[PDB]
Ligand SMILES: *[C@@H]1O[C@H](CO)[C@@H](O)[C@H](O)[C@H]1NC(C)=O
């Protein structure tokens with residue numbers, strides 16, 4: 201029939217500011233029509249790697265909920281946003297499950313997220329005692345204890361601060377330039393699936 | 402938990418914050434160099450002070466991790482690099498005195514202005530006022546005046562300063578568990594802890610003497626030929642049996658002999674390989690020069706330049722309104738930012754310099770995957786040697802014919818190869834005894850073998866013995882004749898040029914054997930050869946993570962610096978010089994026979 205109430209993909213992709221990789225934003229998308237061909241046919245994305253589903257049948261299938269996680273990482277750290285990978289981002293900042301169904305979309309944002317003095321507003325968790333579970337968020341700012349001595353809240357010897365900034369400057373290499381990453385997670389649950397694609401007339 | 406994991410986390414935090422601070426400092430230095438303005442000087446000084454204070458604090462914090470409880474070689478290498486005191490082990494008064502002495506030597510060398518007595522209304526600085534006179538004049542007393550007046554002013558200013566300098570640097574070095582400052586400089590080649598590939602600080606002097614003993618016949622024949630030609634140029638001053646007069650070598654100090662190519666050319670009637678007019682006729686921009694260099698590096702299989710390289714480099718002189726340093730410099734600013742600062746003209750020299758500096762950039766790009774404190778050459782010789790091999794390969798007539806800059810009907814006979822090899826010998830072979838003699842003299846000064854009242858009596862004795870160059874008039878101990886040169890007056894190691902020269906031809910033989918070149922070594926071109934680039938990039942990707950002996954094993958298959966590739970490179974010229982020196986006398990006499 202006549203279709204209205206599109207899913208809010210404009211408030212995820214065209215957001216004026218993105219979150220850091222550690223405090224990554226999660227938006228739950230429900231009870232609307234999700235047109236995925238608008239995203240797939242865009243020329244503005246550098247990575248559109250879909251895991252567990254193909255992009256051509258996304259516009260056909262129907263899902264219970266869509267999770268849109270948004271953050272900013274480096275150019276060389278986009279490869280770690282994948283199932284089964286390793287690195288600071290996967291181990292300490294944002295972990296994807298091995299049984300992940302969804303798409304990882306990344307694009308260069310050197311125009312927006314880099315300033316000539318250095319943009320220190322984007323941070324990443326550099327240390328933690330254990331690796332993250334999938335879809336876990338750690339926003340704690342407690343001093344990492346690398347040694348036997350207690351930190352006692354002061355960043356002294358062997359005690360460092362967990363979150364470190366990426367001083368994004370426009371003159372950086374393509375592996376150090378900021379990349380905005382949106383990860384869409386598609387799950388089907390026993391509830392009635394309501395995020396369906398548009399149906400042709 | 403364990404000390405090693407603690408050191409690894411400390412290195413990770415170090416790396417992360419260091420990379421950012423080094424970037425800020427390098428960008429400030431770039432903005433000073435492309436824009437000489439006082440606020441850029443202030444920003445450079447602020448960034449440099451922050452970088453130095455951060456290195457002091459991390460050196461103070463790295464020492465708390467003892468070395469013997471760490472088994473991983475790379476972690477131990479980074480911790481060894483970080484844990485050096487430097488001048489921090491010295492007292493604050495003496496450290497301030499040493500810094501003041503270094504700065505005032507820099508100002509004396511940079512702002513040294515000398516002109517003729519009784520005509521003092523205007524004077525000429527060293528660059529380019531005295532450089533052009535030394536490189537182009539044919540007058541004996543004019544060159545003698547310039548040489549003696551510049552060593553009078555500069556040496557009589559710098560002699561007490563250097564006497565304080567040697568004592569302070571020896572005090573710092575013995576405070577850093579070295580024998581002298583010469584041992585501190587030789588510690589760059591020290592490899593410890595690797596089975597078989599260990600290299601000692603004491604092995605460096607023995608290897609340098611052992612290689613120079615094989616250098617010596619080729620240099621003796623070249624010296625005899627240059628002596629005969631300078632006797633033709635200056636009829637009565639030069640003796641057939643004696644050393645060369647010091648002020649006639651084409652440069653201020655005798656560092657290079659490349660300004661004597663006009664006087665000492667074998668076959669003037671034959672043409673040169675100058676391609677300047679050919680680029681002017683085809684209207685080659687400096688952008689085209691760097692694009693041809695990039696085409697050379699992609700032909701061998703190395704990665705091409707980033708977009709940020711073309712956006713952010715200054716490859717042309719900006720203009721009259723904006724001032725910039727004219728010296729060509731390759732900048733690894735950090736965070737994947739690679740730039741070249743060169744005021745490129747349309748000449749062969751600037752084209753070869755573009756190849757040389759892009760070789761520096763390729764070397765910097767290759768070890769970008771390494772941790773920050775391991776992002777260097779394996780020693781100080783490799784970093785310059787990998788640029789000089791590109792300068793070797795690009796200068797060949799096959800490369801010029803391949804890129805269209807030389808006529809395809811250019812006749813490559815033996816005479817042009819002889820005079821090309823002689824030009825390369827005046828540049829390359831002639832600097833070797835001067836470099837070796839200067840470093841051996843500085844090592845003997847730091848070791849205390851030479852007392853302060855006998856510095857110059859030994860020095861000229863060394864120059865007659867090694868370089869075969871005699872002083873015009875005797876100098877007493879009020880002179881400081883070594884410190885008129887840039888590197889010695891500004892606290893720089895000088896053995897990097899000797900090691901660079903030998904590593905250059907070792908790398909050239911290894912890559913030409915990889916490229917299956919079937920002719921003479923100087924006729925060899927490494928373009929279009931993927932395997933030569935792969936053999937190069939295997940060493941290039943290591944950086945400072947591996948010992949320089951193991952890197953040299955990776956390229957040439959030898960564990961030590963070798964002299965045979967250089968002698969193989971100059972073998973046509975060596976046979977030609979042996980033929981031309983039948984009537985004349987090879988070797989020199991240390992007596993005062995030419996002039997004293
Ligand atoms: C985001 O912005 C681009 C460029 O302005 C636009 O083409 C696109 O339609 C916008 N929305 C989405 C969902 O990408």
Ligand SMILES: *[C@@H]1O[C@H](CO)[C@@H](O)[C@H](O)[C@H]1NC(C)=O
Nearest residue numbers: 435436437438441719723724
């Ligand atoms: C160089 O510095 C001057 C100083 O005011 C400035 O006006 C100019 O824009 C600078 N040049 C560049 C290329 O930034």
Ligand SMILES: *[C@@H]1O[C@H](CO)[C@@H](O)[C@H](O)[C@H]1NC(C)=O
Nearest residue numbers: 409412472473474475476772
């Ligand atoms: C040394 O540490 C690095 C990480 O810093 C690791 O990749 C490497 O495998 C280690 N080497 C050894 C021999 O343990």
Ligand SMILES: *[C@@H]1O[C@H](CO)[C@@H](O)[C@H](O)[C@H]1NC(C)=O
Nearest residue numbers: 464484485486489490577578
């Ligand atoms: C650096 O100096 C301190 C004291 O000045 C000393 O304890 C330390 O051992 C020195 N480091 C090295 C590597 O010698």
Ligand SMILES: *[C@@H]1O[C@H](CO)[C@@H](O)[C@H](O)[C@H]1NC(C)=O
Nearest residue numbers: 699704705706707708709711
């Ligand atoms: C470098 O080479 C790659 C692959 O050949 C090419 O896509 C890229 O555009 C080149 N870089 C530049 C700056 O031309």
Ligand SMILES: *[C@@H]1O[C@H](CO)[C@@H](O)[C@H](O)[C@H]1NC(C)=O
Nearest residue numbers: 667814815816817819973977
């Ligand atoms: C060059 O070759 C010719 C013929 O082989 C020979 O007569 C001449 O002497 C050679 N010249 C030199 C400098 O080797």
Ligand SMILES: *[C@@H]1O[C@H](CO)[C@@H](O)[C@H](O)[C@H]1NC(C)=O
Nearest residue numbers: 700799800803804926928929
């Ligand atoms: C090297 O490769 C380029 C591109 O294929 C080619 O134009 C050039 O002629 C080659 N060099 C030689 C010596 O043939």
